[PDB]
Design an enzyme around this catalytic site. Structure first.
Site, PDB file in Angstrom:
ATOM      1  N   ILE A  10       0.863  -1.177   0.000  1.00  0.00           N
ATOM      2  CA  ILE A  10       0.000   0.000   0.000  1.00  0.00           C
ATOM      3  C   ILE A  10       0.896   1.222   0.000  1.00  0.00           C
ATOM      4  CG2 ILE A  10      -1.457   1.457   1.466  1.00  0.00           C
ATOM      5  CD1 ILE A  10      -2.860  -1.109   2.434  1.00  0.00           C
ATOM      6  N   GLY A  11       1.719   1.303   1.047  1.00  0.00           N
ATOM      7  CA  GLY A  11       2.720   2.340   1.196  1.00  0.00           C
ATOM      8  C   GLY A  11       3.796   1.942   2.203  1.00  0.00           C
ATOM      9  N   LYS A  33       0.457  -4.496   8.564  1.00  0.00           N
ATOM     10  CA  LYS A  33       1.594  -3.624   8.831  1.00  0.00           C
ATOM     11  C   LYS A  33       2.716  -4.415   9.509  1.00  0.00           C
ATOM     12  CE  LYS A  33      -1.252   0.497   9.190  1.00  0.00           C
ATOM     13  NZ  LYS A  33      -1.159   1.935   9.581  1.00  0.00           N
ATOM     14  N   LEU A  76      -9.342   0.478   5.063  1.00  0.00           N
ATOM     15  CA  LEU A  76     -10.093   1.570   4.468  1.00  0.00           C
ATOM     16  C   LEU A  76      -9.357   2.045   3.248  1.00  0.00           C
ATOM     17  CD1 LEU A  76     -10.564   1.788   7.714  1.00  0.00           C
ATOM     18  CD2 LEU A  76     -11.885   3.801   7.103  1.00  0.00           C
ATOM     19  N   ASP A  79      -6.983   7.889   2.591  1.00  0.00           N
ATOM     20  CA  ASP A  79      -6.562   8.691   3.743  1.00  0.00           C
ATOM     21  C   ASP A  79      -6.903  10.147   3.497  1.00  0.00           C
ATOM     22  OD1 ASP A  79      -4.144  10.120   2.767  1.00  0.00           O
ATOM     23  OD2 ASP A  79      -3.145   8.195   2.820  1.00  0.00           O
ATOM     24  N   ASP A 120       1.076  10.880  17.433  1.00  0.00           N
ATOM     25  CA  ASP A 120       1.584  11.141  16.103  1.00  0.00           C
ATOM     26  C   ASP A 120       0.446  11.226  15.070  1.00  0.00           C
ATOM     27  OD1 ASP A 120       3.466  11.794  14.115  1.00  0.00           O
ATOM     28  OD2 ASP A 120       3.774   9.645  13.577  1.00  0.00           O
ATOM     29  N   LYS A 122      -1.663  12.731  12.089  1.00  0.00           N
ATOM     30  CA  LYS A 122      -1.347  13.416  10.850  1.00  0.00           C
ATOM     31  C   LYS A 122      -2.387  12.981   9.829  1.00  0.00           C
ATOM     32  CE  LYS A 122       2.280   9.981  10.354  1.00  0.00           C
ATOM     33  NZ  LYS A 122       3.729   9.929  10.684  1.00  0.00           N
ATOM     34  N   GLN A 124      -2.190  11.419   7.107  1.00  0.00           N
ATOM     35  CA  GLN A 124      -1.940  10.099   6.536  1.00  0.00           C
ATOM     36  C   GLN A 124      -2.496   9.021   7.462  1.00  0.00           C
ATOM     37  OE1 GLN A 124       2.162  12.104   6.106  1.00  0.00           O
ATOM     38  NE2 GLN A 124       0.251  12.985   6.885  1.00  0.00           N
TER      39      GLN A 124
HETATM   40  C1  LIG Z   1      -4.548   0.821   9.051  1.00  0.00           C
HETATM   41  N1  LIG Z   1      -5.120   0.870   7.715  1.00  0.00           N
HETATM   42  C2  LIG Z   1      -4.585   1.404   6.599  1.00  0.00           C
HETATM   43  C3  LIG Z   1      -5.521   1.251   5.600  1.00  0.00           C
HETATM   44  N2  LIG Z   1      -5.460   1.603   4.257  1.00  0.00           N
HETATM   45  C4  LIG Z   1      -4.522   2.408   3.723  1.00  0.00           C
HETATM   46  O1  LIG Z   1      -3.592   2.831   4.400  1.00  0.00           O
HETATM   47  C5  LIG Z   1      -4.629   2.747   2.266  1.00  0.00           C
HETATM   48  C6  LIG Z   1      -4.587   1.845   1.186  1.00  0.00           C
HETATM   49  C7  LIG Z   1      -4.692   2.322  -0.150  1.00  0.00           C
HETATM   50  C8  LIG Z   1      -4.601   1.447  -1.346  1.00  0.00           C
HETATM   51  C9  LIG Z   1      -4.464   2.026  -2.608  1.00  0.00           C
HETATM   52  C10 LIG Z   1      -4.328   1.245  -3.744  1.00  0.00           C
HETATM   53  C11 LIG Z   1      -4.306  -0.126  -3.636  1.00  0.00           C
HETATM   54  C12 LIG Z   1      -4.413  -0.719  -2.395  1.00  0.00           C
HETATM   55  C13 LIG Z   1      -4.549   0.058  -1.254  1.00  0.00           C
HETATM   56  N3  LIG Z   1      -4.797   3.609  -0.416  1.00  0.00           N
HETATM   57  C14 LIG Z   1      -4.834   4.487   0.604  1.00  0.00           C
HETATM   58  C15 LIG Z   1      -4.953   5.850   0.648  1.00  0.00           C
HETATM   59  C16 LIG Z   1      -4.928   6.212   1.985  1.00  0.00           C
HETATM   60  N4  LIG Z   1      -4.801   5.151   2.783  1.00  0.00           N
HETATM   61  N5  LIG Z   1      -4.748   4.080   1.941  1.00  0.00           N
HETATM   62  C17 LIG Z   1      -6.581   0.670   6.182  1.00  0.00           C
HETATM   63  N6  LIG Z   1      -6.353   0.386   7.466  1.00  0.00           N
END
Ligand SMILES: Cn1cc(NC(=O)c2cc(-c3ccccc3)nc3ccnn23)cn1
Length: 291
Positions: A10-11, A33, A76, A79, A120, A122, A124
């Protein structure tokens, strides 16, 4: 990672990679994570599995296997950082800003009531869905794992939302640090610009001072004895909130001022903030989300 089929990056989060993944047994899509590196942390994090609230991203599991730590969260799709970037030509509508702030304050009030801090916050780690909800991700983790200067992949951890008592070296955090952060986020939603985008600890601190005035013993009793206080700090005058967050109305500015008090003991609590007149007409609008 075989009792998760399909796993995508995801990131890069504060502690390790974040993946989107599907649970094998159940078919559910989750955020996974990886925490990059302690037994004291395990019990602490484990306690957060009980800390359940509609405005808190659910911690589904703590996986301590093969000497590795993975946290499994509710997933979800977007963000608030991405949403505000997507919303930048027009701004987020005030009723939706208001709904989000109100929901975030409910989440904070819950966690604070259970003696759990974020420390923390933010954009994001504020996640949104299609139904108009917003949720706080990563609550309680800083008490367990610390907050680094740089992440595992060398990205700089942002200072923009850090409370002044943290920057001045106070070593005992209180729930007020979360209110400060949320106030910063509130201002950014309204103006479509970060309020205090520092790029070093002193730049962060002086950006605060140039807007809110250099703090002194009148407005913040005890400030001049803080670990990292220096009497040589320049003495800037305070700006009016009418100049800092236009076109926010007087209710919003009043609330923001109370969230951005220097003295953490004067700063409004989440529970008190929910009773502020700004929320008298709150509603829950549907956001326009492109996924
Ligand atoms: C703790 N926690 C984190 C999340 N989700 C995120 O972090 C998350 C996932 C994605 C995403 C984008 C393209 C493909 C697959 C996933 N895009 C965004 C954009 C912003 N957040 N995000 C759900 N639960």
């Amino acid at each position: 990672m075989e009792n998760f089929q399909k796993v995508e990056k995801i990131g890069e989060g504060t502690y390790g990679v974040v993946y989107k993944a599907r649970n094998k047994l159940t078919g559910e899509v989750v955020a996974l994570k990886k925490i990059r590196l302690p037994s004291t942390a395990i019990r602490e994090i484990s306690l957060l599995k009980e800390l359940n609230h509609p405005n808190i991203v659910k911690l589904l599991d703590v996986i301590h296997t093969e000497n590795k730590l993975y946290l499994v969260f509710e997933f979800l799709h977007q963000d608030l950082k991405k949403f505000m970037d997507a919303s930048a030509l027009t701004g987020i509508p005030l009723p939706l800003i208001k709904s989000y702030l109100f929901q975030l304050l409910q989440g904070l009030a819950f966690c604070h009531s259970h003696r759990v801090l974020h420390r923390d916050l933010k954009p994001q780690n504020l996640l949104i869905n299609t139904e108009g909800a917003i949720k706080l991700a990563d609550f309680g983790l800083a008490r367990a794992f610390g907050v680094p200067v740089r992440t595992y992949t060398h990205e700089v951890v942002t200072l923009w939302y850090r409370a002044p008592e943290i920057l001045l070296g106070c070593k005992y955090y209180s729930t007020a640090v979360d209110i400060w952060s949320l106030g910063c986020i509130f201002a950014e939603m309204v103006t479509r610009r970060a309020l205090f985008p520092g790029d070093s600890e002193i730049d962060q601190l002086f950006r605060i001072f140039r807007t809110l005035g250099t703090p002194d013993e009148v407005v913040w009793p005890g400030v001049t004895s803080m670990p990292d206080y220096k009497p040589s700090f320049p003495k800037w005058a305070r700006q009016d909130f009418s100049k800092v967050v236009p076109p926010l109305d007087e209710d919003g500015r009043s609330l923001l001022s109370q969230m951005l008090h220097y003295d953490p003991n004067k700063r409004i609590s989440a529970k008190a903030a929910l009773a502020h007149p700004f929320f008298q007409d709150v509603t829950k609008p549907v956001p326009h989300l492109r996924l």
